[PDB]
Amino acid sequence: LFSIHFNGQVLEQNHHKVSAITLVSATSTTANMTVGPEGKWIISSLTPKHLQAGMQAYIDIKNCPKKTRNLKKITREQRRHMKRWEYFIAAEEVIWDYAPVIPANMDKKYRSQHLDNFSNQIGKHYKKVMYTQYEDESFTKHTVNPNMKEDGILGPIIRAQVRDTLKIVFKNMASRPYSIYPHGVTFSPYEDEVNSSFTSGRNNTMIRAVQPGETYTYKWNILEFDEPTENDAQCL
């Protein structure tokens, strides 16, 4: 198989707004869409079982003024919800292990071997970085001191809407420059938040390299042109 994906630009397979397709033996399927702003998007052919040779591609979107559609930016005079809610994410190195905090079914394979100083292997202080979500400009404690339990090391609950102000205030503080990238989202020419090679002028530059200690906010306004269809489920 081939785990293909259309970064940024979202297709419409079977009249359904999707951005991924991974079947086998060349399934009889075609799609179509409508391009957006100019830029350099990515065709991420991320195939884990097929990477010893190389398979990468991108999208080169220029600008030829021919026709203009009736695409309105904001919602049509009813929905806005302009709020000052920016998702705070700090790439911390809190002590997180494979076994849960005080395991229930007793994961002795990792508790008494790698979780602490038992068996004299790794230790207790780890550097496992996890993407969380804070409630203020502190970068040290979220809604609670530990985690939300229901997600663990996985990302918590994040919902998007019109003018959701997806301003990911990312501030790395570990030992390797990290960033963030939502699956299939169109951003601004100023902020990156996507593995893009589009390095143009200072006006349309985008760099996601966030060194440990430096903070960067990926500001972009998610509006009505970032929502799926009507027949599918609510939140994709």
Added chain:
Amino acid sequence: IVGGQECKDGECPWQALLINEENEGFCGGTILSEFYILTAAHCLYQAKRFKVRVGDRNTEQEEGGEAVHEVEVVIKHNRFTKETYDFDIAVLRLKTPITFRMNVAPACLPERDWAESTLMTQKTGIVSGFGRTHEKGRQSTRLKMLEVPYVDRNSCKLSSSFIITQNMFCAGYDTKQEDACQGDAGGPHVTRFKDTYFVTGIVSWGEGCARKGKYGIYTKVTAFLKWIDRSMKTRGLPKAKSHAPEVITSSPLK
């Protein structure tokens, strides 16, 4: 196809027409016993007076000495939403007791157990009512009671813009013909379960009644057992034999 057939003059007692002192009705009720008449709360609140007459198959005409069931006062309901619709059930406090005649037949009381066996089997139902929920241009002089099927719960929250809870669900045909606001408000959607008759629906208007061919709104009195029990035993024994039986109660239905 079974269309809008009128009610029979035999087994169709549940029709307590709630009118006014003048020649102007508003909604209807449900006959179950001699101390409580289930109907919508907007029948009396934000309306006019209250005049009930059981066994009245026609409003303009009269079939003799049969329509007599006057009401003294009335109260409201706790969960009754004034703006929308939710648990829209009100009890009419009659003033004169009426025996069991031909056009006045009693019915057994519902229970919480008939909630998982009545909705999965009887996927249909009948809506008894003179026709006062949609009093626009279909005011029939004859007591009409059409048949409406039951639909899945996942297709009732989108029938109207108002989010519907569990108390009310679908009780009509698909988006084809006119199957909503049938009969009088507070109309009994009694479903013949098995050897008995238990009402399980009250037709009410949500945002009024216009081009509502999608689905209908009908309550479920199986969950309303805690309200019909708190307003029957806490009131005590009938003092003057149904005065008020008993209207002297708090507004949130005790």
Added chain:
Amino acid sequence: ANTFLEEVRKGNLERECVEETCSYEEAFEALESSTATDVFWAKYTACETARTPRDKLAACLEGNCAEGLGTNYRGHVNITRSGIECQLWRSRYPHKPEINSTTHPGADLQENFCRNPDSSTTGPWCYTTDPTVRRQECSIPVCGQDQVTVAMTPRSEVPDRGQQYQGRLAVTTHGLPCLAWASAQAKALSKHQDFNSAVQLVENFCRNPDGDEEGVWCYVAGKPGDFGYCDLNYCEEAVEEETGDGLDEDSDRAIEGRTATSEYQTFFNPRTFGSGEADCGLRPLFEKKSLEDKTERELLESYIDGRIVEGSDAEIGMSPWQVMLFRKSPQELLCGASLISDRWVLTAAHCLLYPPWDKNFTENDLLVRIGKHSRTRYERNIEKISMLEKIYIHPRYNWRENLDRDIALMKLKKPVAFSDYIHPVCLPDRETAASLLQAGYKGRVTGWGNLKETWTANVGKGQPSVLQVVNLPIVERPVCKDSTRIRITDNMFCAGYKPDEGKRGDACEGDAGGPFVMKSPFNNRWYQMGIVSWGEGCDRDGKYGFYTHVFRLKKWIQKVIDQFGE
């Protein structure tokens, strides 16, 4: 048609009275008729010459030709000689016949054909629908000498509201000639007129010195009153959606939250107009207290869509403004009106001037009552009877075509006050709706059952005491073209409910020209923009009304209040 019982009167009268002796007590019991008894003397009596034989004429026995004088027609012939059908008998529009529909309903007073209500002078004539002539005779054939009566007609054949105009013409509208500037009175009433910059000047032709986007005019003489405007045949291009590009410029939200002190506008001057500038949209009821009663209950259009309207009840206290017209003797309901302040009162023009009706009022028989919730009741502590004394006609009063701008304007001299039952209303301008094309806020057109007793009859509902509102929804344009057989000017739109099978309707309530008072959702204030004209949709079979786009005429009031100080 089913059983031998109803088809017995056709073959009964054969050789007993057609060519024999009969009168009243000789051949009366051989007819068998219980309901159609009195009308039998008029149906059989039609052949003025002779009724013999039977298998030849068949005019005064069934209904085919019009031998004799022509009084009825059984066939379905709606054509006349101009394409427009005859006027319906169950309504009086635009003229008023001698009889209505209350003298004899047994003679089928429906289906507008070719009949004769009074004497016969030529044949089955009709009433002219257009205000041009008065009668339009038909061309119904006649037995015997098949000849054509009258000769039939084959009837076979600057953009941006006009700014940079350079035409060379000088044609008035009615009959008010205007001279030039080299006469004597060149600069008369011109002390506060706001001059713009667009068209140049000229000697004696149609020009636009003020700078109006409506039309051009000149300084006429005649009588010290108003002035006429020039007319030019442009094009029928509608001001619908713009075909350029495809984007807009409107807002996107305006967040829910009443944060508005006093951001109102002012166009007129308090000096030469009076009040009605600041006191607007401030009713001591449920406006300043930030509350909601049972008035504006209009949520989303996707309530549950719409089916058939009914018209609910009302309550005393929700309809403050109520300006109508009445007569001192007798006291009968006329048509609706409006009020912009406390002096100039405007109303419709199709209820005051009608040359064909031969009734022109002066400055005494034109009364006006403001603030009323019933008809039989009569108080004094809540309202006061007003009185008019000044009348003014409209320059472009071309009502003989398709009713083009029929709005009158009087003047009130009684210094009345403003309380709970009397509420004034301002007027919008242009600096607030420059791109609000995707809207359509309706007004509060109150009134009882008055329109049903002015043009038609409508037997069933008399004069109800319920403040019934009138809905005026917004519609496209081709909705009343594929099904409507009569043409309509692009200046006026359509208003009506699409019938499903063939039902009538109940949407012509209120008054004949109620006030269109709309609350502005920007600062919570009632505004007045537009006047409801003549309505239609309850006399045929559920059609569409006609309402002309009358949104301008704002600067015309300012240029005629100059005689208050002179």
